[PDB]
Amino acid sequence: PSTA
Amino acid sequence: NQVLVPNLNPTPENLEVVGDGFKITSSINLVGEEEADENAVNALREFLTANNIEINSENDPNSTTLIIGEVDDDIPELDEALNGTTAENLKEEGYALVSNDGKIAIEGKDGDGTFYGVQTFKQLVKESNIPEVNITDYPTVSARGIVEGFYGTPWTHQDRLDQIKFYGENKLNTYIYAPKDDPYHREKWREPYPESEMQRMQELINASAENKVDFVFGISPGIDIRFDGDAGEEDFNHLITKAESLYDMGVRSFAIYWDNIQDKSAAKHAQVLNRFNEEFVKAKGDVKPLITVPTEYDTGAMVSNGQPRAYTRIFAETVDPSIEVMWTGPGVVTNEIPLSDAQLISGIYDRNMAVWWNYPVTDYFKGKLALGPMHGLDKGLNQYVDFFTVNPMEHAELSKISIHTAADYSWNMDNYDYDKAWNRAIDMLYGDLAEDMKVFANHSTRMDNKTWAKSGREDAPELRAKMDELWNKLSSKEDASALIEELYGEFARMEEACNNLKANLPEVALEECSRQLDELITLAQGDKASLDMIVAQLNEDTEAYESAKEIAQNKLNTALSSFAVISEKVAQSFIQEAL
Numbered sequence: 001p002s003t004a
Numbered sequence: 005n006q007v008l009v010p011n012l013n014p015t016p017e018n019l020e021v022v023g024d025g026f027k028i029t030s031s032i033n034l035v036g037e038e039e040a041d042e043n044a045v046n047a048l049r050e051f052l053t054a055n056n057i058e059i060n061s062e063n064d065p066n067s068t069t070l071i072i073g074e075v076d077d078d079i080p081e082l083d084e085a086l087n088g089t090t091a092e093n094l095k096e097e098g099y100a101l102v103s104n105d106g107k108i109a110i111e112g113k114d115g116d117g118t119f120y121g122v123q124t125f126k127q128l129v130k131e132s133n134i135p136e137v138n139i140t141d142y143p144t145v146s147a148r149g150i151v152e153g154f155y156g157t158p159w160t161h162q163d164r165l166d167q168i169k170f171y172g173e174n175k176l177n178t179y180i181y182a183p184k185d186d187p188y189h190r191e192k193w194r195e196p197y198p199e200s201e202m203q204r205m206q207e208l209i210n211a212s213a214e215n216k217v218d219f220v221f222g223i224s225p226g227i228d229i230r231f232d233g234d235a236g237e238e239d240f241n242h243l244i245t246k247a248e249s250l251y252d253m254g255v256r257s258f259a260i261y262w263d264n265i266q267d268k269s270a271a272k273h274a275q276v277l278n279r280f281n282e283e284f285v286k287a288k289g290d291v292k293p294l295i296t297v298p299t300e301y302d303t304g305a306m307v308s309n310g311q312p313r314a315y316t317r318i319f320a321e322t323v324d325p326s327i328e329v330m331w332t333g334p335g336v337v338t339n340e341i342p343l344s345d346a347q348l349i350s351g352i353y354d355r356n357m358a359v360w361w362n363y364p365v366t367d368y369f370k371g372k373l374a375l376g377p378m379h380g381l382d383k384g385l386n387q388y389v390d391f392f393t394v395n396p397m398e399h400a401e402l403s404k405i406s407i408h409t410a411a412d413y414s415w416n417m418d419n420y421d422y423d424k425a426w427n428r429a430i431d432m433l434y435g436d437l438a439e440d441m442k443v444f445a446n447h448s449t450r451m452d453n454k455t456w457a458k459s460g461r462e463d464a465p466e467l468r469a470k471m472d473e474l475w476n477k478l479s480s481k482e483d484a485s486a487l488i489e490e491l492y493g494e495f496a497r498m499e500e501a502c503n504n505l506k507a508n509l510p511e512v513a514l515e516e517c518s519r520q521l522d523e524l525i526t527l528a529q530g531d532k533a534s535l536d537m538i539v540a541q542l543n544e545d546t547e548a549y550e551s552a553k554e555i556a557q558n559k560l561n562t563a564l565s566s567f568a569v570i571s572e573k574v575a576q577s578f579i580q581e582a583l
């Protein structure tokens with residue numbers, strides 16, 4: 001649900 | 005007696021008060037509307053209808069006169085009313101506005117500029133009163149707006165139409181449709197939109213045009229796109245087909261994204277952008293420059309010991325100079341973009357950069373609302389940046405606070421005062437509830453996931469300073485009863501404010517922050533008991549101490565286990581400190  | 009100049013957003017470049025102001029009459033004379041920008045006239049017509057101001061059929065010498073048009077309109081009555089002011093010498097989207105002695109004149113450098121001149125007009129009028137001013141105005145950055153590119157629940161159709169009206173009014177001219185969790189954008193990019201989705205798109209494109217917003221259609225094929233052979237051909241033709249079906253509805257801006265993917269084939273990434281730029285963007289003749297983001301898109305991921313990494317270096321070496329390239333700053337989510345950081349990245353790309361600013365987006369920390377202003381963005385960034393966009397929250401209505409300040413920052417950059425922009429944002433959006441909304445939002449500006457993501461103005465700094473001042477006064481046995489009585493007021497105010505918001509905020513705003521409002525009331529109560537603990541300890545009253553200590557722990561336990569997150573390092577930390 002996000003960037004790494 | 006005199007008509008003051010109301011809050012304006014963005015801040016106009018040049019404004020001189022040339023008179024006392026006057027009241028616009030019941031009906032007005034309208035001049036230049038046949039040759040002036042179609043959209044600007046419509047925006048002006050709507051405002052007048054809403055404010056019960058009719059338009060005369062034949063000229064009336066007693067009525068207020070309004071003249072409107074572009075530089076490239078031959079309207080002498082317009083130049084006559086501008087009083088030596090001109091839009092002729094301004095950059096694109098610029099305008100001049102003069103209002104003196106019963107006349108209002110708006111001349112835009114182009115259509116976009118005339119529209120924006122009407123937006124300022126709209127903001128200047130209050131209860132039919134207008135100040136007498138001479139204005140010339142133009143943007144610092146030519147591309148200003150929003151990239152809907154977050155993970156999580158994409159904005160509804162209704163959300164987006166309302167946003168586009170909001171951008172128009174604040175002179176933002178770019179909206180990038182790129183929601184990560186839209187299957188047809190990313191996961192299943194090859195597949196055409198269903199007919200009813202295309203009809204929703206059509207409504208968006210229309211509304212964008214009505215508000216002078218460049219609707220950028222984005223596509224993220226980087227998960228599974230093939231590059232070589234017959235497969236590469238087919239996959240490229242899928243981009244063309246997809247972009248064509250949107251061109252055919254009226255889209256004139258396009259983006260192709262490579263962010264957050266496994267495949268780091270820099271050459272083939274740019275080789276695709278270039279071919280699309282040739283066979284589509286240039287071929288069409290009326291399509292704006294192609295926008296992109298590379299797989300390496302933050303300075304940390306792009307640069308190594310002053311020198312670009314293999315991906316970045318090959319990407320810049322290959323990608324056509326006309327293509328807009330986006331980057332996020334020193335990190336994906338970072339405190340600052342200092343001037344030196346833009347210099348480096350702009351250097352590597354030998355071009356003016358585009359900014360993907362990851363704030364107020366909250367997809368990485370969904371418990372907190374990011375309600376702060378643009379912060380840490382260098383005020384001379386226009387030197388290396390000609391394209392500026394923010395990634396907003398999945399909560400559209402509350403994103404407006406942060407976006408409002410982004411409108412001011414990117415339009416009038418060197419004038420940008422973040423505290424003043426923030427205050428104005430809330431004053432303009434919240435009306436009667438502005439003072440209380442400030443109290444609440446003041447605690448919800450800083451974003452921190454404790455690991456890789458940090459950004460935004462620190463939470464309630466004045467209150468943090470008073471808290472630090474207390475511990476210093478106590479541990480060095482100084483008298484503190486003046487500060488304690490002051491802090492009781494603050495915490496009571498926090499509670500009073502949040503309760504008033506719960507009671508009076510319209511649903512569209514309340515349904516986005518109610519859990520956080522609850523969280524802050526709790527902490528304000530935990531803080532009040534924290535003070536009670538301090539007072540009782542000074543009084544050497546163990547009964548009142550233990551009683552207050554339990555209340556304080558009860559509030560802290562509620563906060564630590566609740567989904568909503570607010571004021572971590574201030575209102576929450578104070579209770580933790582007191583234990």
Ligand SMILES: *[C@@H]1O[C@H](CO)[C@@H](O)[C@H](O)[C@H]1NC(C)=O
Pocket residue numbers: 001002003153154155184263264297301332336360362365367368395
């Ligand atoms: C990764 O970072 C942000 C925050 O999670 C996310 O919204 C975005 O879609 C990703 N891409 C870029 C280019 O920031």
